[PDB]
Amino acid sequence: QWALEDFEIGRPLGKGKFGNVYLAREKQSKFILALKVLFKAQLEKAGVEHQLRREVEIQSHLRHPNILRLYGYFHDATRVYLILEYAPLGTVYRELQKLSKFDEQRTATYITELANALSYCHSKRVIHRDIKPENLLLGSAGELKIADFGWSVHAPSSRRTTLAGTLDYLPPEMIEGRMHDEKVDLWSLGVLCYEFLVGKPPFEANTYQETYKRISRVEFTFPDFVTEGARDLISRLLKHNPSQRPMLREVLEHPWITANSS
Numbered sequence: 003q004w005a006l007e008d009f010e011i012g013r014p015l016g017k018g019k020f021g022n023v024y025l026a027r028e029k030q031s032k033f034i035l036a037l038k039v040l041f042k043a044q045l046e047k048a049g050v051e052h053q054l055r056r057e058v059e060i061q062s063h064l065r066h067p068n069i070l071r072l073y074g075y076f077h078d079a080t081r082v083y084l085i086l087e088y089a090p091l092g093t094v095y096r097e098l099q100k101l102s103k104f105d106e107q108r109t110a111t112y113i114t115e116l117a118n119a120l121s122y123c124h125s126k127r128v129i130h131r132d133i134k135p136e137n138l139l140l141g142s143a144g145e146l147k148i149a150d151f152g153w154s155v156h157a158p159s160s161r162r163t164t165l166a167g168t169l170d171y172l173p174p175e176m177i178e179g180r181m182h183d184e185k186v187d188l189w190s191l192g193v194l195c196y197e198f199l200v201g202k203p204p205f206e207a208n209t210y211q212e213t214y215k216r217i218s219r220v221e222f223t224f225p226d227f228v229t230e231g232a233r234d235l236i237s238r239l240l241k242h243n244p245s246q247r248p249m250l251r252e253v254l255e256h257p258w259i260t261a262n263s264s
């Protein structure tokens with residue numbers, strides 16, 4: 003099937019350690035998509051060539067309105083090409099840069115869409131999506147799309163590196179090197195809810211080593227404007243003990259979510 007020759011290429015939307023994402027157009031249909039190009043040299047150098055094969059097969063069978071779809075893939079001698087759904091409105095991170103912070107209705111609606119997406123993932127035994135806001139995209143109707151597949155990429159407008167944003171969202175159990183389970187995704191939801199309402203991630207620090215300590219000790223505080231319902235949900239999700247974190251269905255039914263979400 004697919005070859006590079008089937009596509010018109012436009013500007014790079016972003017770049018990462020492993021390659022770039024281009025605006026592209028399939029020549030026959032004129033359908034616009036995102037062509038993610040990963041360099042085999044970089045994949046081999048990092049030893050992730052086997053991970054990508056595994057994740058491609060997984061992504062192929064993920065179909066959810068709030069997960070970016072993989073349409074197909076191909077390769078040549080030097081590159082792996084992932085044919086991805088194009089999400090026209092950019093990242094949630096950039097929309098946070100523009101708005102500074104989100105109101106409770108927007109936040110609760112987004113958390114609802116992500117919790118649904120993650121519940122679908124867990125049903126497939128797919129866990130630990132990196133749902134930092136740079137990996138969350140906005141479809142043409144403004145729906146959220148989980149898009150961490152194929153590793154991070156940064157748009158030119160970004161001020162946060164690949165590494166830093168991923169670190170901001172790591173749960174204590176992976177910082178500490180312990181076993182983890184699907185509760186890592188509940189932790190990420192709590193970090194995201196906070197960054198949405200506040201405009202900054204809760205464990206942000208000047209150095210990576212300080213960030214590690216803040217995550218491990220769950221050292222976060224709320225600005226005055228965070229409402230008591232938002233504080234309750236975020237506090238339940240950011241528990242050090244994964245067993246203490248709610249079920250995704252309990253997030254979806256939380257009174258602050260149901261009062262504010264679209």
Ligand SMILES: CNC(=O)c1ccc(Nc2ncc3cc(C(=O)N(C)C)n(C4CCCC4)c3n2)nc1
Nearest residue numbers: 015016023036088089090092137149153154155157
């Ligand atoms: C001023 N305008 C814009 O910043 C803008 C940026 C992207 C955009 N669409 C899009 N569609 C599908 C994407 C899959 C990826 C990807 O591999 N990620 C790991 C997330 N990304 C990246 C590329 C760079 C930012 C997100 C995708 N980005 N539409 C508009």
